[PDB]
Amino acid sequence: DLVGKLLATKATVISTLSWITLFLGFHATGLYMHNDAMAAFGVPQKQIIIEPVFAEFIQQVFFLGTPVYGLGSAAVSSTPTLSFLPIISGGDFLVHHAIALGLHTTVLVLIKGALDSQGSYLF
Amino acid sequence: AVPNTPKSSPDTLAGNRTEASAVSRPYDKFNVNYPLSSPDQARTEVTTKEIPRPEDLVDSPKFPLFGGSANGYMSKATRERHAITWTAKEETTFEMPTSGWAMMNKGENLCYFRKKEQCIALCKQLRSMKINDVKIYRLSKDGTVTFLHPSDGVFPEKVNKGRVPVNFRPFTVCQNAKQGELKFTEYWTKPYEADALTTLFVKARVAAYNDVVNLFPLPNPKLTSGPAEPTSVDYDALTKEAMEGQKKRIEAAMASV
Amino acid sequence: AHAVKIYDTCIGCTLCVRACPTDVIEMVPATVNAAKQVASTPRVEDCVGCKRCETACPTDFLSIRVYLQENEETQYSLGLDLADWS
Amino acid sequence: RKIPAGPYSVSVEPLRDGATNEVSIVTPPISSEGVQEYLSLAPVFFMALAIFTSGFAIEVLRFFPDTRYW
Amino acid sequence: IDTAPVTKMKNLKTGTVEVDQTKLSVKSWGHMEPCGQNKKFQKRIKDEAFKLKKRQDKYAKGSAAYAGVQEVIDQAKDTAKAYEGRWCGKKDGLPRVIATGEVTRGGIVTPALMFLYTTGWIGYAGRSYLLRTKDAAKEIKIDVPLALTCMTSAFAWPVYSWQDITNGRFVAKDTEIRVQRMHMA
Amino acid sequence: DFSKAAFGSATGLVAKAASQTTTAIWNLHADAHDFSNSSYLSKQVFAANLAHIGVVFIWLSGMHFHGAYFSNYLDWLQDPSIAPTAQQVSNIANQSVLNPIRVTSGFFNLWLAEGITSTYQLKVIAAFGLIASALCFLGSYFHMHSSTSFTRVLNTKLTSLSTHHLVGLLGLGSLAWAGHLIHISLPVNILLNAGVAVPSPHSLLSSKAVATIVEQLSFSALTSSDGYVWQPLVYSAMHHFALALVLIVGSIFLSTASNPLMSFTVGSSWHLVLGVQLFVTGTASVLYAQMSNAYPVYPYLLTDHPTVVSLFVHHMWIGGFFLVGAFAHLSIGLVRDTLPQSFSVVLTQRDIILGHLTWVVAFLGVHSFGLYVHNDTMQALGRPDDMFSDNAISLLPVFARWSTLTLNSTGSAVSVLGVELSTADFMVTHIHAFTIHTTVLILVKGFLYARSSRLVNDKYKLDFRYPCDGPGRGGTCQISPWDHVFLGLFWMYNSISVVIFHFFWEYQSNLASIKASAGGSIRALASDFELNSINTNGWLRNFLWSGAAQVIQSYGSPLAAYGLTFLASHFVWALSLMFLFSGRGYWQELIESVLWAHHKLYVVPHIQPRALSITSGRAVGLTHYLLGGIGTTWSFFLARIVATA
Numbered sequence A: 001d002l003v004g005k006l007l008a009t010k011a012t013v014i015s016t017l018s019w020i021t022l023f024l025g026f027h028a029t030g031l032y033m034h035n036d037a038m039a040a041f042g043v044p045q046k047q048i049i050i051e052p053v054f055a056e057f058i059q060q061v062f063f064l065g066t067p068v069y070g071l072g073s074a075a076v077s078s079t080p081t082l083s084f085l086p087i088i089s090g091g092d093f094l095v096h097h098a099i100a101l102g103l104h105t106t107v108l109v110l111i112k113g114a115l116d117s118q119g120s121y122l123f
Numbered sequence B: 001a002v003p004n005t006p007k008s009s010p011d012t013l014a015g016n017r018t019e020a021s022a023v024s025r026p027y028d029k030f031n032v033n034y035p036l037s038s039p040d041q042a043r044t045e046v047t048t049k050e051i052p053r054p055e056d057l058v059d060s061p062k063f064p065l066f067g068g069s070a071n072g073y074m075s076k077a078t079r080e081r082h083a084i085t086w087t088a089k090e091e092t093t094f095e096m097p098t099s100g101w102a103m104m105n106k107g108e109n110l111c112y113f114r115k116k117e118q119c120i121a122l123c124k125q126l127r128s129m130k131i132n133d134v135k136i137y138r139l140s141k142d143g144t145v146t147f148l149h150p151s152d153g154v155f156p157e158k159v160n161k162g163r164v165p166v167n168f169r170p171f172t173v174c175q176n177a178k179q180g181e182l183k184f185t186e187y188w189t190k191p192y193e194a195d196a197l198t199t200l201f202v203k204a205r206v207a208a209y210n211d212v213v214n215l216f217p218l219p220n221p222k223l224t225s226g227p228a229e230p231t232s233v234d235y236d237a238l239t240k241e242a243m244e245g246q247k248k249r250i251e252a253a254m255a256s257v
Numbered sequence C: 001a002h003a004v005k006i007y008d009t010c011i012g013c014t015l016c017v018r019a020c021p022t023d024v025i026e027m028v029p030a031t032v033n034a035a036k037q038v039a040s041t042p043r044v045e046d047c048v049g050c051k052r053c054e055t056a057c058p059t060d061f062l063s064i065r066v067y068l069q070e071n072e073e074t075q076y077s078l079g080l081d082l083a084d085w086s
Numbered sequence D: 001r002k003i004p005a006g007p008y009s010v011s012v013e014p015l016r017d018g019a020t021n022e023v024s025i026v027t028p029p030i031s032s033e034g035v036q037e038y039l040s041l042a043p044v045f046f047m048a049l050a051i052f053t054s055g056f057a058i059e060v061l062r063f064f065p066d067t068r069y070w
Numbered sequence E: 001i002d003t004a005p006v007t008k009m010k011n012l013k014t015g016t017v018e019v020d021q022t023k024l025s026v027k028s029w030g031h032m033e034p035c036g037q038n039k040k041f042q043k044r045i046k047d048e049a050f051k052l053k054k055r056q057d058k059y060a061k062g063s064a065a066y067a068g069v070q071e072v073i074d075q076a077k078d079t080a081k082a083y084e085g086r087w088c089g090k091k092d093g094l095p096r097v098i099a100t101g102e103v104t105r106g107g108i109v110t111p112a113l114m115f116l117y118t119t120g121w122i123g124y125a126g127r128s129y130l131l132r133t134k135d136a137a138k139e140i141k142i143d144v145p146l147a148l149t150c151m152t153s154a155f156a157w158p159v160y161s162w163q164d165i166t167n168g169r170f171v172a173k174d175t176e177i178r179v180q181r182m183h184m185a
Numbered sequence F: 001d002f003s004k005a006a007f008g009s010a011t012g013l014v015a016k017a018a019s020q021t022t023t024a025i026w027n028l029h030a031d032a033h034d035f036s037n038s039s040y041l042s043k044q045v046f047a048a049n050l051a052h053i054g055v056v057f058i059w060l061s062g063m064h065f066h067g068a069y070f071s072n073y074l075d076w077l078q079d080p081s082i083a084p085t086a087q088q089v090s091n092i093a094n095q096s097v098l099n100p101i102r103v104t105s106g107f108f109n110l111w112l113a114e115g116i117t118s119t120y121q122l123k124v125i126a127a128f129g130l131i132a133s134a135l136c137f138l139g140s141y142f143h144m145h146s147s148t149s150f151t152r153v154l155n156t157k158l159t160s161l162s163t164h165h166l167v168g169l170l171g172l173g174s175l176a177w178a179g180h181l182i183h184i185s186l187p188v189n190i191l192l193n194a195g196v197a198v199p200s201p202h203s204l205l206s207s208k209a210v211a212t213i214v215e216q217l218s219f220s221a222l223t224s225s226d227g228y229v230w231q232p233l234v235y236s237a238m239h240h241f242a243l244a245l246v247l248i249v250g251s252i253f254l255s256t257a258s259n260p261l262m263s264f265t266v267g268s269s270w271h272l273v274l275g276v277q278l279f280v281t282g283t284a285s286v287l288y289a290q291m292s293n294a295y296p297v298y299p300y301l302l303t304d305h306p307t308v309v310s311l312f313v314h315h316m317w318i319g320g321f322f323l324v325g326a327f328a329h330l331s332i333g334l335v336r337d338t339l340p341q342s343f344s345v346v347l348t349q350r351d352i353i354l355g356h357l358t359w360v361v362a363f364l365g366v367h368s369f370g371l372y373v374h375n376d377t378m379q380a381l382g383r384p385d386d387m388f389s390d391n392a393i394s395l396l397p398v399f400a401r402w403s404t405l406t407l408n409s410t411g412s413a414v415s416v417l418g419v420e421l422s423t424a425d426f427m428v429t430h431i432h433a434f435t436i437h438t439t440v441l442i443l444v445k446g447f448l449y450a451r452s453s454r455l456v457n458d459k460y461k462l463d464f465r466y467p468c469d470g471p472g473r474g475g476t477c478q479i480s481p482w483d484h485v486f487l488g489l490f491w492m493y494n495s496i497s498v499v500i501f502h503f504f505w506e507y508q509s510n511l512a513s514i515k516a517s518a519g520g521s522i523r524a525l526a527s528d529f530e531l532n533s534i535n536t537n538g539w540l541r542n543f544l545w546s547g548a549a550q551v552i553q554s555y556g557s558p559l560a561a562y563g564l565t566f567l568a569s570h571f572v573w574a575l576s577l578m579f580l581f582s583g584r585g586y587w588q589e590l591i592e593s594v595l596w597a598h599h600k601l602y603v604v605p606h607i608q609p610r611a612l613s614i615t616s617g618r619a620v621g622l623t624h625y626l627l628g629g630i631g632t633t634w635s636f637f638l639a640r641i642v643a644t645a
């Protein structure tokens, strides 16, 4: 069944989750350390600030009623509605990648333990 | 001495240690033949005359050259004792299992310990020093002595006749039934205690469940007080065709093997 | 009492017997291995659960398995030295 | 070697007669094949690779400071 | 007594979501502008130059420390001139990295390709060494000629790897490797 | 041959399939210096010691080389108030902000105490240090490969070794240093303090210089020899001369005919000697850390506050580490000896000693931290008069405030050293005592329960370093003497961290108080430490959070390196948490999945990937924990004391 298929290829699931977590942690930590070094060395301009252009695109096209970033769309709503959606910037990219790293690592540990409850080569 | 040791007897301090262990830990019991594996295994019997309780021995000649230590058993706080009776060829030094050092007597030797693990460690040390006939006994609260370790006279490292296998499971470790397969049975949480027949039966049952093309619907019970529902399906014809399917499937499966 | 089991894969090493600090494992005759001997555990009540027997078993996986049962602890299984329950 | 001396010793046996005019070279009897084998060890080889990579990065950063050509 | 800055949503009841094609480019985005005319970026550069000059003034003219700080100042000036072509917001002035996929100043496609080629080179060199040195001895004891042969021969990794993938010499059949089947699948 | 045997460990690792795992590599590293018992054990130990001496000589030569070439030592000589920097930093990446790094090792003050005035002298010392390191390496080679077995030095020739160390090494070194002081370190400091130029040091050994210019042997010389930077060197010279005399006289007036190592094997004898030597070196390091700020001995040392703080903290850490290693090697020697009957009284009073120490630790912990928590609660509840302070229930350390005695021609140190103590000093001293007692409890427990215990009765068969005995008996993890040293290292970290926190806050409080101005003479309490180091909140606010401003606002300044090391230390410390909280099995299963991923792509490494063993994981976690905590304190202290002093 569904669970049997998940168990049979549990090695693939655990390995790919491990790769995702390794990539996310490596890059988030490395970019944060690079920004730390640049700010420490009095060169804040040379930080790696990857603009969260995908979330900005979603926000501008689907949520925002005024041109805040201008990417994807620039139309202004004639009768906008109000809410408390924050306006994102460069740091939010790294923070969301940290969030993704945390979620993926938690899922990795939980899935790995659940699927190895059926047994590992050590047990 | 009253400050050195409590003034009351070990039995007085024990209170109702028995009749409470039977209540607090009803699972904690020995099998009918504790030191042995089969009922017809000689079962050599010893008494307090042979191995007396330590509180009845003062400056016994069989005691080794031991100076006493704080690491020994709890007199007046525990009543169970384990004794070692080994015969030496010469007077040499050995490590006590409770740390410190004692010197063996030329002939008979006798030590008392609380845990059997200490006695077995001392036996390992002595056998490493070329000593046979290391006999380990257990002293109970009332003084009943149980002979242990070379229970049938032959050390467990050497195979001996009359020893029935115990806790032997006739398959591989991972051939035990899974907990889900043994659900709602007495072996649900302990699949390693199930019988070989039970494990094989449930491992075949899970396979039987996964063949719904031939699995039987098992009609609903008649619980309502009203008349039987006419329905539109004949359970008798279904049962007959299921008998035919079972017969043909068994024939084909046995032809395969 | 931590249940200890012996399986067909046992090859009569006697290493599990020598590794037991409480004389639980015991060598019985059998006709399943070339050694014509198989470990048995007739004194499980003395098993502390140290799993030294599992450390000394050379088979691909443990021909002797110690299943810890924390809901059935015993003064012999807990290795009590200063408290007596008998 | 009745006198207890460590393995791989360049020491003559201390049980000698009257003063001997002998040549006892105190230098390790190393081998060119052995030295090349030792420098090919995984720790040595990979630490040398790491040092080479780090120095290459150092020189690239020195002669091309920052990411000016991004 | 006030709340957080309230943002205005699009009451998009028209039943269609319009994505402007002309806004799919960095040059058309109203929140990022080139660093050359970014006033905040220019102020950052001026502050950096002023701090470097202040640090230089501590050491007397002609000293080695003076020359070192002067070289630092020249490096900062050249870096600023290079970064004038980058894209840096409108209120921060810090140059940004555009990870959309557009090939722009400070983009990601070229660095991604360079890194992927380099690390595929590394991985293929290691894999080739392990395939041609199926021995733990040659793993602990690196066969330096063969190791460097594999390292310099892995330059063709992107095509050799795909050829092996499509020809079955790259991946291993699941029935031939140690896969976890302890549940007796 | 020898080159072939250099990688002999790796050849043996690859020879057997059982050693073709990463665990074998980690064992090869862990068992690197664990010189096994053999006929050449003493040769190996002595050669390793000589090699380490050569390494330290390399370090000293490098430090003198940096002083000669990459330091403003001459400018510091012309003006001691300037920042001592002895590490140039090249313009790579963007690190140019921290180009002059203020060195706090005190080498400038040391060299000034040695009469060094020219960088040429530092170059010569660096060259001679390299020469000495080369000689030490040659000697270590020789002893390992061609020399005596050295097996008689701890049992048979212990009298000769001890007598040589007493007379020759110690006494003659002290006498030679006294001669150096009197002849070139006093006159050079005289001519520098007076500003009358310094000749070549050898010209002071002319019998026509101030040695015979005036024969007056008291504090009277040309013009006015009233330099108080110079008197500590005079006292040091007198101390060294007296110490040399007393050592030489007492060595020949001592029995020394008692070697307690007759009953121990050579390996266990070496381990016990190492343990007692580590104890002595650690307590000496702690004593020097106290005496560095207790008594001024180096020129312009107390003025350089970062140097004082660094010396104190570094030597406290080294003393704590060596004190822990003392018990570590005592445990190793006890557990690895065949018949260690010498410790019979303590192995038979095992439970008595351990339980009394347990009660002492419990009493001290509850009392000290309850004083702290009670002060926290009373201050939170707005009850300052119910706290433990000077304006409240006063825990005055009366035993501290008395050293009066018959004079008999003495002075200075006949008192409490001119410092008054208060409730905060009492409470923090009891915290120090409790933490020291707990570290000693763990270490002594590891020593005593090393061969046997009530839980496991054959722990001597398990050697010194084992992960556990199994999950039986309820669980027997961390019973090994190694694991007791592992926990004692954490408790030493806690103890020394609190000690250095107490010292640093007291030092900053005294610096602020002496910065009254001149007119301000009622310090009331003020004394930020004395007024606030009575609560855990007081510490957390007025010491950690208060002084962290320097280390967290260091970006763009030369202390940005301290800020970055602060962050990296936090990172390493949380990684330690990762290693310490987790277990080997999980990581093994994760590595199994990753290795399946590898095998799927025909990668298949043969050195089978195994996760770190239980003891290896604990050791890695402890190493990262110590590194992170000590680095955080290092960055914090250095940034705070350099920015503000």
Ligand code: CLA
Pocket (backbone or CB within 6 Å): A018, A019, A021, A022, A023, A024, A025, A026, A027, A029, A030, A101, A105, A108, A109, F571, F572, F574, F575, F576, F577, F578, F579, F581, F582, F590
């Ligand atoms: C700061 C503390 C810390 C850190 C860094 C990690 C890091 C990690 N944990 Mg972890 N963990 C921690 C605390 C921490 N843990 C604690 C306290 C617990 C509770 C016990 C756990 C419990 C836990 C579990 C149960 C699991 C992890 C896993 C992981 C890994 C996830 C993959 C990843 O992000 O790779 C990124 C790796 C890092 C960020 C480590 C630092 C690497 C460098 C220094 C940073 C990058 C620098 C630069 C880019 C490299 C330069 C390259 C070249 C120039 C030389 C990773 C190694 C999972 C795992 O192993 O899956 C793979 C997993 O299953 N951890």
Ligand code: CLA
Pocket (backbone or CB within 6 Å): A015, A016, A018, A019, A022, E122, E123, E124, E125, E126, E127, E129, E130, E142, E146, E147, E148, E150, E151, F593, F594, F597, F598, F601, F603
């Ligand atoms: C031949 C070398 C080699 C190759 C081809 C691979 C290939 C792979 N590894 Mg891997 N790995 C290696 C060495 C190698 N690894 C080493 C030495 C370690 C120990 C640190 C690991 C630890 C490791 C983990 C923990 C994980 C992978 C994963 C992966 C897969 C995804 C790629 C990835 O995340 O890489 C990232 C690689 C690393 C994080 C470690 C790289 C360390 C160095 C750079 C690699 C060594 C190269 C080698 C020494 C070259 C020598 C050549 C010379 C002898 C000629 C991929 C199949 C992931 C996976 O299963 O995803 C499906 C995963 O979770 N690997």
Ligand code: CLA
Pocket (backbone or CB within 6 Å): F060, F105, F106, F107, F109, F110, F170, F247, F281, F282, F284, F285, F288, F298, F311, F315, F318, F319, F322
């Ligand atoms: C990790 C090891 C380590 C490191 C890196 C340092 C580093 C440093 N130490 Mg140090 N130290 C250590 C361990 C260490 N120490 C230990 C374990 C001790 C205890 C013995 C000391 C004791 C010590 C003293 C006493 C002094 C230093 C000093 C110094 C600094 C100058 C170094 C120098 O060339 O002076 C070389 C050192 C000296 C010239 C002092 C020699 C004093 C002698 C050797 C003391 C002998 C005591 C011994 C027990 C006598 C036996 C008495 C018995 C007969 C009754 C430097 C920062 C000096 C300093 O702060 O200067 C700024 C300084 O005065 N250290």
Ligand code: CLA
Pocket (backbone or CB within 6 Å): F029, F030, F031, F032, F033, F034, F035, F274, F278, F321, F322, F323, F324, F325, F326, F328, F332, F464, F465, F482, F485, F486, F489, F623, F627
């Ligand atoms: C005079 C000092 C001294 C000496 C000679 C020894 C000697 C020995 N110790 Mg020992 N020890 C000491 C002090 C000393 N110790 C102290 C002070 C402690 C308490 C911290 C200990 C704690 C200790 C334990 C717990 C154990 C030993 C063991 C051993 C033996 C094997 C050591 C080995 O293989 O390590 C090989 C060398 C290493 C592992 C070094 C690796 C680096 C370490 C782990 C961390 C260093 C981090 C570094 C400082 C920071 C990096 C810089 C940063 C900027 C990145 C050997 C007899 C072991 C044994 O079995 O003894 C028989 C053992 O289990 N020791």
Ligand code: CLA
Pocket (backbone or CB within 6 Å): F366, F367, F368, F369, F370, F371, F373, F374, F377, F386, F387, F393
């Ligand atoms: C362990 C450390 C410690 C100590 C010494 C104190 C001390 C005190 N607290 Mg306190 N407190 C603490 C921790 C501590 N606190 C902690 C951790 C908290 C947080 C929960 C509080 C919260 C707290 C509150 C909320 C209050 C106090 C108050 C008080 C005071 C009165 C307490 C009282 O009635 O005494 C009771 C004392 C005893 C019953 C006697 C016990 C001690 C005896 C003498 C031991 C004798 C042993 C004997 C010598 C053994 C040998 C015998 C043999 C020779 C025969 C007193 C100054 C009160 C206050 O405001 O007063 C200022 C108050 O209202 N405390």
Ligand SMILES: CC1=C(C/C=C(\C)CCC[C@H](C)CCC[C@H](C)CCCC(C)C)C(=O)c2ccccc2C1=O
Pocket (backbone or CB within 6 Å): F578, F579, F580, F582, F583, F584, F587, F610, F611, F612, F613, F614, F616, F617, F618
């Ligand atoms: C993570 C972890 C492992 C896995 C650790 C392994 C497999 C060690 C291998 C890690 C490699 C060697 C890291 C190499 C160094 C890093 C790349 C970082 C240093 C270099 C950077 C700073 C650039 C254990 O084996 C373990 C065992 C017992 C308790 C806890 C743990 C535990 O927490």
Ligand code: SF4
Pocket (backbone or CB within 6 Å): C009, C010, C011, C012, C013, C014, C015, C016, C017, C038, C039, C056, C057, C058, C059, C063, C064
């Ligand atoms: S060690 Fe394992 S295989 Fe050998 S006799 Fe014991 S149970 Fe059987």
Ligand code: SF4
Pocket (backbone or CB within 6 Å): F467, F468, F469, F470, F471, F472, F475, F476, F477, F478, F614
């Ligand atoms: S948890 Fe680890 S250390 Fe503790 S008993 Fe189990 S295996 Fe041993």
